[PDB]
């Protein structure tokens, strides 16, 4: 029942306790389960600057360049290896510039070691009239994208290909800024940076809404969830200068890091918290329970808006999708199950609550990406199809 007691799972005993890691994790701390390590390739960091996205590798203390853009990249979220081809997908938002509306973009991120040798193209979900999409969240169970827009004051859900668009919350919103989703619980959490800042949680289908924090909030600008230690919620404040954690039901609230140098984004991995300093362009990490002292990893370009952690086990892919193909347009998770929803400007066919009266839309398959592994090189054929050429010592298709 103690907060700091264990990083992932705890078991009681007549005169003691045991800490244990969940599946996919291993324990190698001096004390069993006091710290956990994650299988697979080492974690990576994703660093969206003003007009470019950069990658960092914690295991090698190495830097790589991934994406360049002509507009201010605001929020980043990713989907891990949705096709099993070894390339994750990244989703990012760009704000409106002058008369040009904002947009949400889709790109491929290789899970293997790669950099500029594999140029990455961009796809646009086609979500029209976006103005200031300050927040982005990905749902890997339901295969949905969730985003928050501060000028329209809305939270909207769509299919990862932008194929169906629904509005979940429109009323009583003041500058929605950050959004996070938990598909296991079927809950979504977001922050409001309005005149009266707030932290709210709702059902991933919008049918239930609650406010978890409405006091001592200056500018909740970042939101992260911890699924390995319960389902805790963590948010960063760059005006209160604090990182705070609550239970997803609001029954518990704690202050984890004090004198956080203007924290603007949060991520949690292997018992450590990672956050960014608004103006310093710095990345700082500490222990997620507030223990010890804080350390500085990178001194990145001052434009760093967010830090994200990229790893197979950050999001539990194993989580089962309950939609079972019953709904015809949209299926949205809720605690203990699912619900059906129609695109905006539509309603259910008379008498039904599982069918919608709206045009059907074809899945938008993303173009073939550059897949040259082992430090190979990628070149486009005359028909624009991608092809690979490999460096000394590597051969076969792509660079397998």
């Amino acid at each position: 029942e103690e907060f700091g007691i264990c990083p992932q799972s705890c078991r009681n005993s007549k005169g003691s306790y045991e800490c244990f890691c969940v599946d996919g994790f291993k324990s190698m701390s001096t004390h069993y389960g006091e710290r956990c390590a994650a299988d697979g390739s080492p974690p990576l960091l994703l660093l969206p600057e003003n007009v470019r996205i950069r990658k960092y590798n914690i295991s090698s203390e190495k830097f790589s360049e991934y994406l360049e853009e002509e507009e201010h990249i605001q929020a980043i979220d990713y989907d891990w290896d949705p096709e099993g081809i070894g390339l994750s997908v990244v989703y990012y938002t760009v704000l409106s510039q002058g008369s040009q509306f904002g947009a949400i973009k889709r790109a491929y991120l290789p899970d293997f070691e790669s950099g500029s040798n594999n140029p990455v193209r961009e796809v646009d979900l086609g979500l029209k009239y976006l103005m200031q999409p300050d927040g982005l969240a990905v749902d890997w169970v339901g295969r949905h994208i969730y985003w928050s827009d501060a000028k329209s004051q809305r939270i909207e859900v769509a299919t990862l290909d932008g194929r169906y668009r629904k509005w979940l919350i429109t009323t009583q919103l003041d500058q929605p800024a950050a959004i996070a989703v938990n598909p296991k619980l079927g809950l979504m959490f977001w922050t409001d940076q309005g005149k009266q800042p707030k932290i709210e949680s709702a059902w991933m289908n919008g049918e239930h809404r609650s406010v978890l924090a409405s006091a001592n909030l200056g500018w909740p600008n970042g939101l992260s969830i911890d699924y390995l230690n319960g389902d805790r919620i963590y948010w960063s404040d760059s005006k209160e200068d604090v990182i705070e954690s609550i239970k997803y039901d609001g029954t518990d609230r704690r202050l984890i890091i004090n004198d956080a140098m203007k924290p603007f984004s949060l991520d949690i991995f292997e018992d450590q918290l990672y956050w960014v300093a608004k103006e310093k362009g710095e990345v700082w990490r500490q222990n997620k329970f507030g223990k010890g002292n804080k350390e500085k990893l990178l001194v990145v370009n001052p434009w760093l808006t967010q830090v994200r952690i990229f790893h197979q086990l950050r999001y539990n892919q194993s989580v089962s999708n309950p939609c079972k193909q019953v709904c015809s347009h949209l299926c949205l998770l809720r605690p203990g199950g699912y619900s059906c929803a129609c695109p905006q400007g539509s309603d259910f066919v008379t008498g039904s609550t599982v069918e919608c009266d709206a045009a059907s839309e074809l899945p938008i398959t993303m173009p073939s990406p550059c897949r040259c592994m082992h430090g190979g090189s990628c070149y486009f054929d005359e028909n624009d199809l991608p092809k690979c050429k490999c460096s000394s010592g590597y051969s076969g298709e792509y660079c397998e």
Partner: protein, 130 residues
């Protein structure tokens, strides 16, 4: 765009008339001499949100209201957020924030009926007394 994309704000530094009002930004917003705009809330709160510091020229601080439990006001007539009051940082340069008068430990409640008194300045429920 109203957002400093140059650290020196030289991008917005030469913006033309953005609105026929002669102003550079709309309502429910604050404007700075560098032609950069910021949420009015950030005015006079111990952070140069405008890189040129124009968002908190000390003369501006007197106007913003600050409720005592959620926000704090410093002797410099500048306002600071509640958590900052004893975070260990001089969030306001006068160093009123972090003053021992404010930070010192609480005054324990006087022992009520059904309770007991201890030399320790502590109160114990009567049943626990022995």
């Amino acid at each position: 765009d109203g957002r400093a994309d140059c650290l020196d704000a030289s991008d917005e530094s030469a913006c033309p008339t953005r609105f026929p009002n002669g102003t550079y930004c709309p309502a429910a917003m604050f404007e700075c001499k560098n032609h950069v705009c910021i949420q009015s809330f950030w005015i006079c709160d111990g952070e140069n949100d405008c890189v040129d510091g124009s968002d908190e020229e000390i003369h501006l601080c007197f106007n913003v209201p600050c409720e005592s439990p959620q926000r704090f006001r410093c002797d410099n007539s500048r306002c600071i957020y509640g958590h900052q009051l004893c975070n260990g940082v001089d969030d306001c340069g006068d160093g009123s924030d972090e003053k021992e008068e404010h930070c010192r430990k609480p005054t324990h409640k006087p022992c009520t009926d059904t309770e007991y008194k201890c030399s320790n300045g502590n109160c114990v429920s009567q049943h626990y007394v022995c």
